[PDB]
Amino acid sequence: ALGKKAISKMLNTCYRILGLKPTVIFADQIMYTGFAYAARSGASVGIDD
Amino acid sequence: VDIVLNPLGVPSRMNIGQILETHLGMAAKGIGDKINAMLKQQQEVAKLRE
Structure with a gap:
């Protein structure tokens, strides 16, 4: 499922x-x-989301 | 745009200004965009008076 600690124990x-x-x-x-895909996933906020 | 930030601190600390103050900010400038309109079109003093 890929998570913080999951990818941690990966390495x-x-x-x-x-x-x-x-x-x-x-x-x-x-x-x-990793950075490439993070860009493609701009997490928006402000009233709208 | 000249400035770019992240309201990621809101869901964390209660500085709801990032959601809000921004919203309303643009509101007040919008009214200005119509003042812009009502002058750039060479309108008489009565139109913009109302």
């Missing part, structure tokens, strides 16, 4: 089973793609 098993380095590269790339 935790990733590290506790494989290692450090793969986690490094992992984190970075997701960051960029």
Whole structure:
């Protein structure tokens, strides 16, 4: 379902089973793609929403 | 637009100004947009007097 702590343990098993380095590269790339979709999802407020 | 903020602090702290003060702000400028209209069209003093 993907959640804050869910994606948290994502990388935790990733590290506790494989290692450090793969986690490094992992984190970075997701960051960029993540921001892309966050833009497409402009959460509006103010009276209207 | 020159400024961009986020009313994300409202659902968190009760500074409802972000929803409201903004709403009404534009209201008061709208009336000004018709004053703009009622002058840019070269209207007599009686039209805008009413």
